[PDB]
Ligand binder design. Structure first.
Ligand SMILES: [K+]
Ligand SMILES: [K+]
Ligand SMILES: [K+]
Ligand SMILES: [K+]
Ligand SMILES: [K+]
Ligand SMILES: [K+]
Ligand SMILES: [K+]
Ligand SMILES: [K+]
Ligand SMILES: [K+]
Ligand SMILES: [K+]
Ligand SMILES: [K+]
Ligand SMILES: [K+]
Ligand SMILES: [K+]
Ligand SMILES: [K+]
Ligand SMILES: [K+]
Ligand SMILES: [K+]
Ligand SMILES: [K+]
Ligand SMILES: [K+]
Ligand SMILES: [K+]
Ligand SMILES: [K+]
Ligand SMILES: [K+]
Ligand SMILES: [K+]
Ligand SMILES: [K+]
Ligand SMILES: [K+]
Ligand SMILES: [K+]
Ligand SMILES: [K+]
Ligand SMILES: [K+]
Ligand SMILES: [K+]
Ligand SMILES: [Mg+2]
Ligand SMILES: [Mg+2]
Ligand SMILES: [Mg+2]
Ligand SMILES: [Mg+2]
Ligand SMILES: [Mg+2]
Ligand SMILES: [Mg+2]
Ligand SMILES: [Mg+2]
Ligand SMILES: [Mg+2]
Ligand SMILES: [Mg+2]
Ligand SMILES: [Mg+2]
Ligand SMILES: [Mg+2]
Ligand SMILES: [Mg+2]
Ligand SMILES: [Mg+2]
Ligand SMILES: [Mg+2]
Ligand SMILES: [Mg+2]
Ligand SMILES: [Mg+2]
Ligand SMILES: [Mg+2]
Ligand SMILES: [Mg+2]
Ligand SMILES: [Mg+2]
Ligand SMILES: [Mg+2]
Ligand SMILES: [Mg+2]
Ligand SMILES: [Mg+2]
Ligand SMILES: [Mg+2]
Ligand SMILES: [Mg+2]
Ligand SMILES: [Mg+2]
Ligand SMILES: [Mg+2]
Ligand SMILES: [Mg+2]
Ligand SMILES: [Mg+2]
Ligand SMILES: [Mg+2]
Ligand SMILES: [Mg+2]
Ligand SMILES: [Mg+2]
Ligand SMILES: [Mg+2]
Ligand SMILES: [Mg+2]
Ligand SMILES: [Mg+2]
Ligand SMILES: [Mg+2]
Ligand SMILES: [Mg+2]
Ligand SMILES: [Mg+2]
Ligand SMILES: [Mg+2]
Ligand SMILES: [Mg+2]
Ligand SMILES: [Mg+2]
Ligand SMILES: [Mg+2]
Ligand SMILES: [Mg+2]
Ligand SMILES: [Mg+2]
Ligand SMILES: [Mg+2]
Ligand SMILES: [Mg+2]
Ligand SMILES: [Mg+2]
Ligand SMILES: [Mg+2]
Ligand SMILES: [Mg+2]
Ligand SMILES: [Mg+2]
Ligand SMILES: [Mg+2]
Ligand SMILES: [Mg+2]
Ligand SMILES: [Mg+2]
Ligand SMILES: [Mg+2]
Ligand SMILES: [Mg+2]
Ligand SMILES: [Mg+2]
Ligand SMILES: [Mg+2]
Ligand SMILES: [Mg+2]
Ligand SMILES: [Mg+2]
Ligand SMILES: [Mg+2]
Ligand SMILES: [Mg+2]
Ligand SMILES: [Mg+2]
Ligand SMILES: [Mg+2]
Ligand SMILES: [Mg+2]
Ligand SMILES: [Mg+2]
Ligand SMILES: [Mg+2]
Ligand SMILES: [Mg+2]
Ligand SMILES: [Mg+2]
Ligand SMILES: [Mg+2]
Ligand SMILES: [Mg+2]
Ligand SMILES: [Mg+2]
Ligand SMILES: [Mg+2]
Ligand SMILES: [Mg+2]
Ligand SMILES: [Mg+2]
Ligand SMILES: [Mg+2]
Ligand SMILES: [Mg+2]
Ligand SMILES: [Mg+2]
Ligand SMILES: [Mg+2]
Ligand SMILES: [Mg+2]
Ligand SMILES: [Mg+2]
Ligand SMILES: [Mg+2]
Ligand SMILES: [Mg+2]
Ligand SMILES: [Mg+2]
Ligand SMILES: [Mg+2]
Ligand SMILES: [Mg+2]
Ligand SMILES: [Mg+2]
Ligand SMILES: [Mg+2]
Ligand SMILES: [Mg+2]
Ligand SMILES: [Mg+2]
Ligand SMILES: [Mg+2]
Ligand SMILES: [Mg+2]
Ligand SMILES: [Mg+2]
Ligand SMILES: [Mg+2]
Ligand SMILES: [Mg+2]
Ligand SMILES: [Mg+2]
Ligand SMILES: [Mg+2]
Ligand SMILES: [Mg+2]
Lengths: 127, 200, 253
RNA sequence: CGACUCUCGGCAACGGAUAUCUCGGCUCUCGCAUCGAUGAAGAACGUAGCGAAAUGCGAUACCUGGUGUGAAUUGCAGAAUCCGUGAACCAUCGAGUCUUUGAACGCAAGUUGCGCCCGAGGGGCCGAGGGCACGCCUGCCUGGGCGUCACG
RNA sequence: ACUAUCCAGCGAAACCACAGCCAAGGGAACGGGCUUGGCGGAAUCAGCGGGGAAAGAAGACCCUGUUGAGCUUGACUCUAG
RNA sequence: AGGAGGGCGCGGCGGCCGCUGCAAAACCCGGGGCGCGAGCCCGGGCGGAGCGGCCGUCGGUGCAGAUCUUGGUGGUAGUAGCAAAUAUUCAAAUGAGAACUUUGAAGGCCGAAGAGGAGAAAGGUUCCAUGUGAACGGCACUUGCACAUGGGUAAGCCGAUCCUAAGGGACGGGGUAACCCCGGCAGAUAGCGCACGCGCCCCGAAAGGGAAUCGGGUUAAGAUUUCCCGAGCC
RNA sequence: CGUUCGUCUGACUUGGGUAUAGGGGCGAAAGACUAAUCGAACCAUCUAGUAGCUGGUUCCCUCCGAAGUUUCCCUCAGGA
RNA sequence: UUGAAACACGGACCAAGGAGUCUGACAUGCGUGCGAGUCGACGGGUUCUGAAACCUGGGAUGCGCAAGGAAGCUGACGAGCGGGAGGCCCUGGGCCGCACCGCUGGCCGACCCUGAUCUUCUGUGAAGGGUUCGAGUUGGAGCACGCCUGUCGGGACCC
RNA sequence: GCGACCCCAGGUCAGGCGGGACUACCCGCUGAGUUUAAGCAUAUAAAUAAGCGGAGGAGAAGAAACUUACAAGGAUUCCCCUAGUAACGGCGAGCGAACCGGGAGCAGCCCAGCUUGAGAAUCGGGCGGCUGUGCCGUCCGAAUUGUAGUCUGGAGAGGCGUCCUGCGACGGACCGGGCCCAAGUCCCCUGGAAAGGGGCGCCUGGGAGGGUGAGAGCCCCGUCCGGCCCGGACCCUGUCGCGAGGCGCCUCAACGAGUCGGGUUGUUUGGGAAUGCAGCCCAAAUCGGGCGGUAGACUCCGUCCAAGGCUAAAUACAGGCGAGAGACCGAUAGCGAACAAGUACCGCGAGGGAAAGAUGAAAAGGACUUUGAAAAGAGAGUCAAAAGUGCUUGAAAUUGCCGGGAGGGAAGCGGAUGGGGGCCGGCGAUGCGCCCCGGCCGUAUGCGGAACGGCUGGUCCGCCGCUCGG
């Protein structure tokens, strides 16, 4: 049970905050679980999805399929994975959007801030 | 109006609905008042939270003649008889009321006694590390000085009930208490006529 | 505990609208006089008009809170406390107490020191009071109706009510995440917990300190025998409610 | 046997009730105290590669700058950026810019109308830029009157 | 001569308890419906002004209401000047 | 008329007992029943995500009417009607389609105080070109004052602007609780020429007064004096 | 709207500008006109004005069940 | 409406919405607690789910527990009788008799009468009263809350 | 003529201040009527609406020219009570406070007057300096028609004697911001999708809420308990380092004027021979002045000291900025506005003022063939589904078609049958006692548990060993 006076339990307020969220907040909202091997190696549970991350789909009709993130459509709350597509009625190809809460990250793209973020999250999850 | 009712008197002929005062903020008022009392208590840590010392007075008017309560402050004559300069009294937690006067001795003495009891309980901190001042306390007295809550010097309302056992003498009887009340009332209402005849 | 609700004081009166009178073959309801828009000429200022005013608009000075005599409240708590000790009335309220050793169910003061939810579950299993908590854990579901859309989305049954006495115990923390299980202190027992829904027979687990304090609080038939000033335990109108033992007595028969 | 009218059922229409929802409303409680001649509120006109409105902004014009975060924005297209002084229709704010107006202030006003002064910079000419309302206060400068005097 | 009439195209409104042939009776004292009789046979077109006490308007005449308003005066009570 | 009792139904809240993607709510049915009745229970269908019953308690809680409100829909009815301003016809072209568009020919009307040619108010792009889904142009259209995309208004001389008219505002002053109402009530009148000399506010007219332009040419659309050529003027 | 008709160098017709605003204006006078509004315009508010008067007033069954008469009332279609 | 099928008004149809409510003051009734008391309503304390809840302030806050009188001011010195449910005794009679009804009184106060005695000389009150008057007493029953109904102020059933 | 001053004038002189906006709360003025009185004029509506101004985070009020009658209390404000009371009122309708008492919160101060004359000791500005919301220096000015200091009735001055009197360093507390902070996406089934059902597990001081393809504690954000870091606020406070006032005693003692107060007139009040306020007339005092709720005179008594100024807190808050919640509404509801809503549109103008939410998990938004001038159709494709861009569901009125039935100037309706149709099978039975086949044990025992009555007796189960009826 929540105790903070400053935190709202109102369903109307929580839905408004979720859907009217800026781009920088959708990044945290659009986080993905790490795979078992990666969670063991980094001692972190979940990470925000990024472009060029390697991902596996674990829910839906594309469950089991793998690829790399080609697009993070934050406006639509979906990510696009390489070669996860569908043919239209005219025969063209369209990328299918998947919610990042239904995938697991298998390989991470690390520049310099991914490592720093991994260090911050590990310490809490390690102590 | 149709039956055996009271004559109605409803004072609702004006725009009374623009002047309705509800009390939905009553529990919030209680919390705001409680919070300020805790903030005020921390602002004065060793000083008592109940405010300065108050005297004892009789409530006025014949209905409340016999009840005692807290006054506004001590008279300038009471402070002088206890040895407390009137400029020092507010600074050490005593209220001063220059309007009030002392007409009877017993009211005055009980207030002077109250100040003496307060002075034996008061612990004064020096305004610096050096205790060059005279009214300051020893380091031991300051070392254990907490904050008291509530009324550290209560006021007794009304004379305590006490049924005594006495021997009824022969003068206690045949006193004619009703006759005394009537003759004294007559002496009051005959005073003006008696004084008129005396002058003539 | 209710919060007041009301409609606006303006609420259907912020139009300018006058009646057309008779002589035009329309009803005498007030009408919007504008012109040039669909609102012109429509009914206004009436409980029967679209966009009108409610018949008796709800005002904020309704009587929301109700006064109960302090003495009557203490009688109700004492009557709801005694109903918690007869096991038949507890079963009638739906509590599962088939494996409870003794219904007054006094537990040792060691439970006052537990601080984990897993420890609390272990305590309930020892006293046979976990099937009641399981039933409350189940049956948790969405509330049907409009209260769903309001901020009351889940409902459930009531489980055991745990009563402690120490006033500083961490047993409150160990039990507060179990659904349907409430924790109360003996010095501030609530009738809303003792008789949920106005139905007497709550399943109560007493720690030993709480049970021993139960005579200091609520006292007895002696006048100064308790903390509550100006209160005596209520007296039954019938000294022996055993109807069979009175009808089939020797003097009656 | 048929047409017409009425009626019963099935399917199709017309219409938008009912049901389930809801980034809205209403009510209550709490905290805080911050508009303007240093030009406010309000009004106008502009401003995007593709925009009319709403939203934003002001010729630095859906933005410049700082800080934070850390790889997007996306309806289409092109550019920029990635182990980085570094993407973003991101957050936040200390640095900036801020057209015509409006208490509105050179005079006006159904007028982008009618004046005066200074002036970088290139005698005179052309200047970029800027001033010139009213009431009042303290001080100051230039004055008026035998109003009250003094000495010549 | 233009309409009306007939055609192609386009295309309203007023009004509507349900309806729509009569005689007499009784009845809120002038019935489409009720009672007793006369009767009474699909579906359609052009007109017509007897009826529908036809429509149009909560009678404007009349009265009532402890409803007004305009005007007058020797009404009552005031008032600028 | 009226009173009262006992029940039926709607929506919440506190409790209890349940249902549902093996299909909830709502809706439909010449389906089957229960109850005097308000109502209820089941079946079949549709639909695709929630709902019910019992105890207590609470309420914006039950419709046929109010010339009731809002919305939708009938008959009337393919009916009333589309009749002022004299009038059309032929051939061709275009086009899916021509009584209505375009060309030619013919017959007529307005008759120059016009149905002609240009302006002031008012409108604001209706102006010109190209194109055409629907709607609209009360029949129709290939067609447009519709719609879509573009283009188009050039001044020292034409006007405004300058002046004053009836009149309006307004400094000081006067009144006024303030908003505001008063301009002749005279107040050191706020300055003008060459130290010297003098000294009796603004707004208000594209029909009043008034610096100065003519001819010819040019565009899809301008210029009845703005662009070009030439010739002048202030 | 058609035909007919009144006046037509004057107390003539008319454009623009300007003045007068609601118990006020303006009136060769009809209570005329003052934006389709005039024996007191229009707009918003007071205001959900008042009404002894007209209309309406929403589920079932069961039981009981009237009065239009007395008195008083600016009382006579109303109240007690 | 005395009287409607009416040549008396409203109603073309359908869906959704649509009218005795909320608050204050009294009153009777009923239900709950306590009871010569009752009310904890404004405040304070506390409250780890809480605008709940729980505790606490009354030796005088409000209604009650005492009237009458304009007021000054005085203020209940303790009942019988008839009928009575029920209980008891004897074998129809007797005893005790609640509530309620009826009758006659006593006491308090307003008004009027009355006056031994004490007394601060104007007060007191042994006795003795009254075709007078009271929302009195000789029964302590009330206080708080809840609900329906009724009257009244409010938009006040709706237009 | 040179001068000093007074009053005044002009400056785009140097530096400064003001005007407008906002409405919930607050301060000042001005001011109705509808309405009620069952008519209506006083009264009520109401010292309200409208109208004109002024502020703030609160405002205003505030330290007795106050109450009372007591054993007396002791600034303001707000709450409860006083109290629907005293009073007022065609004494009608109605109206209507205060004192005491109990709470919340408490706090008292600054001037003018006589008071430098051995020295205007005071203040502002220009300029310069610095240690900079200020300090110092210098020069000008203001001011004697009075700046500073002392003093304010509680006093005080004067006289005589004893006790009291800045800087920094490091934290706390207050406000804001950031970062981190538990546990399954294991197996089977159904479904387009598991977040549903079944099986096996884990977290919990976290089972508030939200998202994600269906009811998700463990998929994600969060929630709990905490920890870490950054930034404000310059008061408040906790440890460190470095003459004047009070008190006792004793002759002066100054205190606010066209103001008080009185008359009258108007208005207002519960204020009644007059509650406050205002205009006008009269017009003060210092052994005096103002009150003690009935006008007057006289004698006592109680009580205050106006006509100058400031002052936190408790209190108010339909506005603004920012939070939280609800037995509230659910698209004809709730604000007029869930949406480019004070919008479209209407009026010369002041003003008036709507309607309008929902495909699907994902546009996967319907390629292509054929007919047609096109719009479209017919096939086809996507989807779990055409749910086919006003697309969730999709009632009634009303309409078309197909099938059935009836009909001589209405039809519908109640009762009763019949003809035809549509339904239904808990619409309606097939078992029960006697006999040859399949297949279980008493009585007694050892043992284990657990009963009823108030020490005897009871049932069950598993095991034996005799037994035979089921
Ligand atoms: K309040
Ligand atoms: K049909
Ligand atoms: K709905
Ligand atoms: K001009
Ligand atoms: K035709
Ligand atoms: K007849
Ligand atoms: K009139
Ligand atoms: K219910
Ligand atoms: K020009
Ligand atoms: K001109
Ligand atoms: K003539
Ligand atoms: K003529
Ligand atoms: K003219
Ligand atoms: K008028
Ligand atoms: K009447
Ligand atoms: K009718
Ligand atoms: K009554
Ligand atoms: K009491
Ligand atoms: K009397
Ligand atoms: K009512
Ligand atoms: K200086
Ligand atoms: K969830
Ligand atoms: K003085
Ligand atoms: K007066
Ligand atoms: K005096
Ligand atoms: K609306
Ligand atoms: K569908
Ligand atoms: K048919
Ligand atoms: Mg009123
Ligand atoms: Mg009609
Ligand atoms: Mg509404
Ligand atoms: Mg439901
Ligand atoms: Mg934008
Ligand atoms: Mg201007
Ligand atoms: Mg006939
Ligand atoms: Mg008829
Ligand atoms: Mg017949
Ligand atoms: Mg026929
Ligand atoms: Mg015909
Ligand atoms: Mg006819
Ligand atoms: Mg005819
Ligand atoms: Mg009529
Ligand atoms: Mg009429
Ligand atoms: Mg009337
Ligand atoms: Mg009458
Ligand atoms: Mg009149
Ligand atoms: Mg008249
Ligand atoms: Mg049917
Ligand atoms: Mg239901
Ligand atoms: Mg409701
Ligand atoms: Mg209703
Ligand atoms: Mg209806
Ligand atoms: Mg009805
Ligand atoms: Mg109608
Ligand atoms: Mg309608
Ligand atoms: Mg029609
Ligand atoms: Mg025709
Ligand atoms: Mg015609
Ligand atoms: Mg033609
Ligand atoms: Mg001709
Ligand atoms: Mg001709
Ligand atoms: Mg032309
Ligand atoms: Mg054209
Ligand atoms: Mg057409
Ligand atoms: Mg166009
Ligand atoms: Mg010209
Ligand atoms: Mg001029
Ligand atoms: Mg002029
Ligand atoms: Mg002026
Ligand atoms: Mg001009
Ligand atoms: Mg001209
Ligand atoms: Mg042209
Ligand atoms: Mg004519
Ligand atoms: Mg006039
Ligand atoms: Mg004329
Ligand atoms: Mg006339
Ligand atoms: Mg109006
Ligand atoms: Mg009379
Ligand atoms: Mg009638
Ligand atoms: Mg009649
Ligand atoms: Mg009838
Ligand atoms: Mg008739
Ligand atoms: Mg009628
Ligand atoms: Mg009709
Ligand atoms: Mg309805
Ligand atoms: Mg007597
Ligand atoms: Mg007497
Ligand atoms: Mg009404
Ligand atoms: Mg200057
Ligand atoms: Mg201002
Ligand atoms: Mg009246
Ligand atoms: Mg009336
Ligand atoms: Mg009248
Ligand atoms: Mg106002
Ligand atoms: Mg401010
Ligand atoms: Mg103040
Ligand atoms: Mg004083
Ligand atoms: Mg006081
Ligand atoms: Mg009372
Ligand atoms: Mg009043
Ligand atoms: Mg008061
Ligand atoms: Mg008090
Ligand atoms: Mg000066
Ligand atoms: Mg001085
Ligand atoms: Mg001194
Ligand atoms: Mg001295
Ligand atoms: Mg986590
Ligand atoms: Mg499971
Ligand atoms: Mg679904
Ligand atoms: Mg006076
Ligand atoms: Mg007067
Ligand atoms: Mg006044
Ligand atoms: Mg007196
Ligand atoms: Mg004074
Ligand atoms: Mg003062
Ligand atoms: Mg003040
Ligand atoms: Mg406060
Ligand atoms: Mg606010
Ligand atoms: Mg709406
Ligand atoms: Mg609805
Ligand atoms: Mg118009
Ligand atoms: Mg769905
Ligand atoms: Mg649909
Ligand atoms: Mg239908």
């Amino acid at each position: 049970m929540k105790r903070n006076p400053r935190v709202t339990s109102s369903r109307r307020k929580c839905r408004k905050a979720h859907f009217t969220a800026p781009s920088s907040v959708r990044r945290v909202l659009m986080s993905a679980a790490l795979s078992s091997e990666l969670r063991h190696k980094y001692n972190v549970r979940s990470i925000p999805i990024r472009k060029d991350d390697e991902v596996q789909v674990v829910r839906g009709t594309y469950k089991g399929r793998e690829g790399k993130v080609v697009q993070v459509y934050r406006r639509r709350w979906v990510i696009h994975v390489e070669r996860i597509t569908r043919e239209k009625v005219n025969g063209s190809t369209v990328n299918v959007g998947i919610h990042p809460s239904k995938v697991i990250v298998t390989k991470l793209k690390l520049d310099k801030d991914r490592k720093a973020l991994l260090d911050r999250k590990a310490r809490g999850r390690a102590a | 109006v149709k039956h055996n009712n009271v004559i109605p008197n409803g004072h609702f002929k004006k725009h009374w609905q623009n002047y309705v005062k509800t009390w939905f903020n009553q529990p919030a008022r209680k919390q705001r008042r409680r919070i300020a009392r805790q903030k005020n208590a921390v602002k004065i840590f060793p000083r008592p939270t109940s405010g300065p010392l108050r005297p004892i007075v009789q409530c006025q008017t014949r209905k409340y003649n016999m009840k005692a309560r807290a006054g506004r402050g001590f008279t300038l004559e009471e402070l002088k008889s206890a040895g407390i300069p009137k400029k020092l009294a507010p600074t050490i937690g005593i209220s001063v009321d220059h309007r009030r006067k002392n007409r009877s001795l017993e009211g005055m003495q009980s207030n002077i006694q109250r100040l003496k009891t307060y002075k034996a309980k008061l612990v004064i901190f020096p305004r610096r590390a050096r205790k060059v001042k005279a009214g300051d306390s020893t380091p031991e007295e300051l070392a254990n000085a907490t904050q008291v809550q509530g009324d550290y010097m209560p006021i007794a309302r009304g004379e305590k009930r006490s049924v005594e056992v006495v021997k009824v003498t022969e003068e206690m009887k045949e006193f004619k208490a009703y006759g005394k009340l009537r003759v004294e009332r007559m002496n009051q209402r005959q005073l003006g006529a008696r004084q008129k005849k005396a002058a003539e | 505990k209710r919060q007041p609700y009301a409609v606006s004081r303006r609420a259907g009166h912020q139009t300018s609208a006058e009646s057309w009178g008779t002589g035009r073959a329309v009803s005498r309801i007030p009408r919007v006089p504008g012109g040039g828009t669909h609102r012109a000429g429509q009914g206004a200022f009436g409980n029967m008009c679209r966009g009108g005013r409610m018949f008796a608009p709800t005002k904020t000075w309704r009587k929301w809170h109700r006064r109960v005599n302090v003495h009557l409240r203490r009688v109700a708590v004492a009557s709801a406390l005694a109903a918690t000790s007869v096991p038949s009335l507890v079963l009638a309220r739906g509590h599962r107490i088939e494996t409870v050793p003794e219904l007054p169910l006094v537990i040792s003061d060691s439970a006052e020191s537990i601080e984990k939810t897993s420890q609390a579950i272990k305590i309930l299993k020892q006293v046979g009071a976990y099937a009641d908590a399981e039933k409350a854990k189940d049956s948790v579901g969405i509330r049907p109706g409009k209260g769903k859309m309001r901020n009351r989305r889940y409902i459930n049954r009531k489980g055991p009510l745990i009563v402690y006495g120490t006033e500083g115990s961490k047993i409150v923390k160990a039990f507060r995440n179990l659904p349907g299980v409430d924790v109360a202190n003996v010095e501030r027992l609530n009738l809303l917990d003792l008789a949920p829904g106005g139905h007497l027979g709550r399943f109560v687990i007493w720690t030993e300190s709480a049970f021993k304090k139960l005579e200091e609080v609520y006292g007895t038939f002696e006048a100064p025998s308790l903390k509550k000033k100006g209160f005596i335990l209520p007296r039954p109108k019938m000294a022996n409610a055993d109807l069979g033992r009175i009808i089939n007595s020797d003097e009656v028969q």
